[PDB]
Write an enzyme that holds these catalytic residues in place. Structure first.
Site, PDB file in Angstrom:
ATOM      1  N   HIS A  32       0.828  -1.204   0.000  1.00 36.73           N
ATOM      2  CA  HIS A  32       0.000   0.000   0.000  1.00 36.73           C
ATOM      3  C   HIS A  32       0.869   1.262   0.000  1.00 36.73           C
ATOM      4  CE1 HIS A  32      -2.104   3.014   2.719  1.00 36.73           C
ATOM      5  NE2 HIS A  32      -2.885   2.993   1.652  1.00 36.73           N
ATOM      6  N   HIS A  82       1.629  11.512  -2.083  1.00 34.16           N
ATOM      7  CA  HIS A  82       0.893  10.972  -0.942  1.00 34.16           C
ATOM      8  C   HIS A  82       0.188  12.219  -0.437  1.00 34.16           C
ATOM      9  CE1 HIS A  82       0.681   7.968   2.571  1.00 34.16           C
ATOM     10  NE2 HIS A  82      -0.348   8.789   2.626  1.00 34.16           N
TER      11      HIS A  82
END
Length: 296
Positions: A32, A82
């Protein structure tokens, strides 16, 4: 040789698995937010880092699925993000890395998931999808076949799992609904259905249950070759005080790894985890791979 021993090679574990088996049926280790491994600043680490090693390390530890989050730049390139945080990694870097691994271990295949993490940089020519499709997807490594993709076709290639809208090029797994913070089920194409447990931002208890219940479902619905089961073990919460994905991973990883080992399943699904390493007790990715002894 079709031996179960061959699964022990974290760099060549898909080798013994038969060509006719749909990828969906294979139990696959995945990571992930794969590109967050270069983060060093403690603040961005307690906020964004979900992995501590590189792409090549992850692959050599069995990982075949990658959660790539992109951002379109002025330079008309896609870089990994991110949230608003620029990860010092690029899409070319990932693909470059994937090719070298596939070059060394052609029996293997890597599944690339691509999502748009942040808004296009003001100044880019094309849109996110077209830029990805013109500049990158066009490369031969990318499998252009669709449907319930089998192992044999994907070998030595990268299979796309589109998590963006606006595609105009056939190949991989079509984009689908995917609602926020939830476990759901839908249809990818005409030859495959999906079940995804993606309950991020939820109680530690609700999370573990959600992982285990989804895993029990796949355990019993094992022989259903036309069904995708993606089980995310990764969990994030209000960090800045031992509430990081790192604190959670240290507990959830061994927890689930043991649960798998204990239960000895025939199918565990596609398990996407945070922090793939050699620190935790039982080793999640190893138990997930071993559950393929069934296909051999």
């Amino acid at each position: 040789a079709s031996s179960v021993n061959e699964l022990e090679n974290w760099s060549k574990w898909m080798q013994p698995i038969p060509d006719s088996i749909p990828l969906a049926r294979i139990s696959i280790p995945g990571t992930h937010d794969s590109g967050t491994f270069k983060l060093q600043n403690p603040i961005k680490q307690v906020w964004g880092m979900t992995q501590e090693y590189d792409f090549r390390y992850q692959m050599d530890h069995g990982a075949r699925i990658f959660d790539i989050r992109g951002r379109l730049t002025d330079d008309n390139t896609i870089v990994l993000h991110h949230g608003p945080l620029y990860l010092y990694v690029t899409l070319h870097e990932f693909i470059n890395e994937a090719k070298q691994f596939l070059k060394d271990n052609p029996s293997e295949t890597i599944i690339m998931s691509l999502k748009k993490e942040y808004e296009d940089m003001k100044g880019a020519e094309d849109s996110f999808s077209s830029t990805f499709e013109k500049k990158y997807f066009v490369d031969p490594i990318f499998l252009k076949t669709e449907g319930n993709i089998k192992l044999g076709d994907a070998r030595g290639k990268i299979v796309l799992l589109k998590r963006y809208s606006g595609s105009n090029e056939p190949g991989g797994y079509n984009n689908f609904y995917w609602p926020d913070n939830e476990t759901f089920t839908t249809t990818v194409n005409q030859n495959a259905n999906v079940t995804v447990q993606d309950k991020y931002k939820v109680s530690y208890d609700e999370k573990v249950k959600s992982i285990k219940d989804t895993m029990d479902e796949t355990m019993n619905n094992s022989e259903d070759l036309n069904h995708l089961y993606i089980n995310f073990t990764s969990l994030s919460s209000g960090g800045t005080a031992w509430n990081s994905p790192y604190y959670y991973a240290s507990y959830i990883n061994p927890e689930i790894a043991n649960y798998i080992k204990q239960k000895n399943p025939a199918r565990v699904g596609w398990v996407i985890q945070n922090y793939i390493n050699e620190k935790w007790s039982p080793l999640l990715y190893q138990e997930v791979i071993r559950a393929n002894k069934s296909l051999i």
